[PDB]
């Protein structure tokens, strides 16, 4: 139930002449590959991005993908030629192909296609098919593309066989990076809340890995209920940032502490009290002309 391998493709078609395709690959939440319109070859982003695969095993895939890219571009352009009143430029296609990893190689595979931001077509079993809620005009292009059994045989190999085989290789080749532990660093803050005579207390938490984290404002053991957890925000160095905020009246701040629990911290939870020796000092290094 652990990991999910994703090959994310994004294609833009503005006019007949102008088009581009950019692709990124994610294992868990770590980027493994990068490939852009200008780059003829797929670039590695980790020292273990090739996995267990040979130089030739890899070159088979890269050549098969290079051939696919230019084939995909021209095939979309011809589909717009075919679909004249029904669909027209500009076109945005998003492909999400990969395989979810489990114990004992359960390795579920998926190939999901979005069109103009909406999920429409799924490869399944042996063939393409439109999902519930798809535009009706897609029925014909799917038939046209399903007539190619050669493409189908290649995709079925990629999903059923080549996907799980490749990613297991990555799961070992990059075992160190996947299982690494990075410690969160917390610092307190506050802004005036919308209501007059109220303060919004902010607890920043930055630089932690893996992604599971526990952040709650507290007054002793009693957990403070009005704590609002933010959305996980990515740092450039493959680490995570999160802020948790509590809202209170002015003067009610004393006694409060931002508690943070993380896997990297061992048993030692970061308990950071509001008016601490360190908060006083760290706050003085922050002052500015609001």
């Amino acid at each position: 139930k652990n990991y999910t391998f994703r090959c994310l493709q994004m294609s833009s078609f503005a006019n007949r002449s102008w088009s581009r395709t950019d692709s990124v690959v994610w294992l868990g939440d770590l980027q493994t590959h990068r490939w852009s319109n200008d780059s003829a070859t797929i670039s590695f982003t980790k020292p273990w991005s090739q996995g267990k695969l040979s130089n030739q095993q890899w070159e088979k895939l890269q050549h098969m993908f290079q051939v696919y890219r230019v084939s995909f571009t021209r095939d979309i352009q011809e589909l717009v030629k075919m679909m004249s009143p029904k669909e027209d430029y500009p076109i945005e296609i998003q492909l999400s192909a990969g395989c979810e990893m489990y114990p004992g190689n359960a390795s579920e595979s998926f190939l999901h296609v979005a069109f103009q931001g909406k999920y429409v077509v799924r490869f399944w079993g042996t063939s393409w098919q439109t999902v519930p809620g798809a535009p009706s005009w897609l029925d014909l292009p799917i038939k046209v593309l399903n007539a190619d059994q050669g493409t189908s045989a290649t995709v079925q190999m990629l999903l059923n066989d080549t996907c799980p085989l490749f990613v297991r290789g990555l799961l070992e080749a990059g075992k160190s990076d996947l299982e690494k532990q990075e410690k969160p660093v917390a610092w307190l803050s506050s802004v005036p809340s919308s209501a007059h005579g109220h303060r919004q207390l902010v607890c920043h938490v930055s630089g932690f890995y893996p992604k599971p984290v526990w952040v709650m404002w507290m007054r002793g053991d009693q957990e403070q209920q009005g704590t609002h957890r933010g959305d996980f925000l990515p740092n450039a160095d493959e680490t995570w940032y999160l802020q948790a905020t509590l809202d209170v009246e002015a003067g009610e701040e004393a006694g409060l502490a931002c508690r943070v629990k993380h896997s990297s911290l061992g048993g030692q939870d970061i308990i950071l009290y509001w008016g601490s020796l360190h908060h006083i000092l760290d706050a003085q290094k922050m002052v500015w002309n609001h």
Epitope: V67, S71, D75, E78, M82, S84, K143, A147, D148, T151
Partner: T-cell receptor, first 114, second 113 residues
Framework: GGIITQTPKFLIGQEGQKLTLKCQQN?????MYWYRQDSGKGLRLIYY???????EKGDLSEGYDASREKKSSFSLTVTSAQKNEMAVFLC????????????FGKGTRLTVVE | TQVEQSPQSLVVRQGENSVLQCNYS??????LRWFKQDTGKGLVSLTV?????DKTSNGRYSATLDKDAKHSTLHITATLLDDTATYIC?????????????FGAGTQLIVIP
């Protein structure tokens, strides 16, 4: 079941004269093509269609235009005939659900006379 | 070009066997097919080859496709006078109606009685 026919079989034209070639077809084919066979050269695509209405440019699209009136009918136009132009034009129809199923007409031989 | 046929002109005795060659560069290479064209006539389909290494025979016409070598061969068994035509080798680059055909220059076969 059916035949892909193109009329006329032979065409007598003049320099600068606007020329038209027609192509009727019985199969329920959506895709239709126009080729020109140059002596000692392979066929080159001029215009093709998916129905309507549809006229997509090929590789020898310059000098010609084309129009598709019906599913059956597909017409090619020669804007201005080169003075000494002697060429064969070929019409082909194809299936949209089977790329292998392609049928060709008997051809059209042109002589531009002055 | 992208599809070469060799030789340009071939001559065989009436009754013999004749061999026609076709090399290509086109990618991808979904299928390869052969056409017979008489003088002042259209193109007639003889054989369609689909597989990696494929063999198809239709009447006296027979063909072998080698996708790895990007090479194909047409055989005519017991050559007749009626086979004094042009033979065209065409390759389709996709397995759907979206693909385009690539036409070889052709080979004139002349049959000596």
């Amino acid at each position: 079941g059916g035949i892909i026919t193109q009329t006329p079989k032979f065409l007598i034209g003049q320099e600068g004269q606007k020329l038209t070639l027609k192509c009727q077809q019985n199969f329920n084919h959506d895709t239709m093509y126009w080729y020109r066979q140059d002596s000692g050269k392979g066929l080159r695509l001029i215009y093709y269609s998916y129905g309507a209405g549809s006229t997509e440019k090929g590789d020898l699209s310059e000098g010609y235009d084309a129009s598709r009136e019906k599913k059956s009918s597909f017409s090619l136009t020669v804007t201005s005939a080169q003075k000494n132009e002697m060429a064969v034009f070929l019409c082909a129809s194809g299936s949209l659900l089977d790329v292998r199923e392609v049928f060709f007409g008997k051809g059209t031989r042109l002589t531009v006379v002055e | 070009t992208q599809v070469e046929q060799s030789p340009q002109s071939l001559v065989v005795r009436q009754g013999e066997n004749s061999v026609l060659q076709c090399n290509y560069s086109v990618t991808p290479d979904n299928h390869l097919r052969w056409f017979k064209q008489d003088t002042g006539k259209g193109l007639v389909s003889l054989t369609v080859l689909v597989d990696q290494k494929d063999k198809t025979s239709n009447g006296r016409y027979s063909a072998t496709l080698d996708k790895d070598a990007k090479h194909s061969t047409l055989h005519i068994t017991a050559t007749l006078l009626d086979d004094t035509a042009t033979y065209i080798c065409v390759v389709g680059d996709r397995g759907s109606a979206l693909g385009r055909l690539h036409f070889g220059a052709g080979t004139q076969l002349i049959v000596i009685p």
